[PDB]
């Protein structure tokens, strides 16, 4: 599935992401844009051997298990395949475990480099929330 911006914003809100640990809603929409381009089935094999899965690109060496990555920790305790659904529940639940404090969105390099310091609220203005 490929989400439109307002459609994803509404779903993320219903799933409790607005102000989660002090982070405004637009941060999460901006991150999804640069990580998977709103595509719920996106994947990316990193040179280091791990692969990133889904709308929020969850990693296979630390967070989910793909049974093919050396040193897998699987901290979210979930198979990487289970994160490719059209329903964002699983991906949101793992994202909440990753961000344990007010500085946790640093977990996504694309957010740190391309979202932090910009008007992230611009991604949600005009969306009927």
């Amino acid at each position, epitope marked *: 599935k490929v989400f439109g911006r307002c459609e994803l914003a509404a779903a993320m809100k219903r799933h409790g992401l607005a102000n989660y640990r*002090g982070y*405004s809603l637009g941060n999460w929409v901006c991150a999804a844009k640069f990580e998977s381009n709103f595509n719920t089935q996106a994947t990316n094999r990193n040179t280091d051997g791990s692969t990133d899965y889904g709308i929020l690109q969850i990693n296979s060496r630390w967070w989910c298990n793909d049974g093919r990555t050396p040193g897998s920790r699987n901290l979210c305790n979930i198979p990487c395949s289970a994160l490719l659904s059209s329903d964002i529940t699983a991906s949101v639940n793992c994202a909440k475990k990753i961000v344990s404090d007010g500085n946790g969105m640093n977990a996504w390099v694309a957010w740190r480099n391309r979202c*932090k*310091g*910009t*008007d992230v609220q611009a991604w949600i203005r005009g969306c009927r*929330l």
Partner: antibody
Framework: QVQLQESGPGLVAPSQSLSITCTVS????????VNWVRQPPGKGLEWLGM???????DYNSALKSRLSISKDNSKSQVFLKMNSLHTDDTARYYC??????????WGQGTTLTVSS | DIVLTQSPASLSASVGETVTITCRAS??????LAWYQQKQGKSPQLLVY???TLADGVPSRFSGSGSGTQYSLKINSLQPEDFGSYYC?????????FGGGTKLEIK
């Protein structure tokens, strides 16, 4: 430790322009915005404008034609320039860091008086 | 532009009393409202953000509420260090504006 400090000319003639510098430390200007706010003696706060981490700018509607904000990321400095001074411009000027829609750290301010 | 109407202009109260300040906007600001406290001769300090979140180190006696166009700040059993001025500020798009301020004074 996040710190912000303003530097200005104190007294300026209505024939010249206003230029104030905000020197910061403890964080990178590329990841946070910086807002400018003023307060006339004995009065309330007035929003002047801002520069986002990415360099984009936004200004107070009534004052936009005579204000200009810029910055130097490598030197950790933000600049405010204002022209066409009036005695109504007499006030304490502050720079403040913005973090995800709240002004979390403020400078001590610098006073400015418009001469005749 | 969206303007903020803050009331009342001043309050006279005693330690131990509870007080409330209101801030109403001319247009919907979608919960993007913050509150600041300013002591005599000092710079403003952040108290609350996104309507209800208390800033670090801020005492639990302070509480914020609101939605759409109407908001409020409440201080339960006020203490000596709470006297001073208070200001609301919105962050819905640009330009941003501040309310006119409220002066909390000893009765």
């Amino acid at each position: 430790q996040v710190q912000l400090q303003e530097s200005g000319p104190g007294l300026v003639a209505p024939s010249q322009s206003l230029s104030i510098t905000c020197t910061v430390s403890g964080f990178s200007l590329t990841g946070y915005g910086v807002n400018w706010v003023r307060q006339p003696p004995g009065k309330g706060l007035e929003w002047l404008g801002m520069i986002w981490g990415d360099g984009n700018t936004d200004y107070n509607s009534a004052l936009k034609s005579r204000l200009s904000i810029s910055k130097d990321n490598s030197k950790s400095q933000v600049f405010l320039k204002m022209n066409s001074l009036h005695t109504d411009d007499t006030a304490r000027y502050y720079c403040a860091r913005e973090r995800d829609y709240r002004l979390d750290y403020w400078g001590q301010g610098t006073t400015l008086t418009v001469s005749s | 532009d969206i303007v903020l109407t803050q009331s009342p202009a001043s309050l006279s109260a005693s330690v131990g009393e509870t007080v409330t300040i209101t801030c109403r906007a001319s247009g919907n600001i979608h919960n993007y409202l913050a509150w600041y406290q300013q002591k005599q001769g000092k710079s403003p300090q952040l108290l609350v953000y996104y309507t209800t979140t208390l800033a670090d180190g801020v005492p639990s006696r302070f509480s914020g509420s609101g939605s759409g166009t109407q908001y409020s700040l409440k201080i339960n059993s006020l203490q000596p260090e709470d006297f001073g001025s208070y200001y609301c500020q919105h962050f819905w798009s640009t330009p941003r504006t501040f309310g006119g301020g409220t002066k909390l004074e000893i009765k």
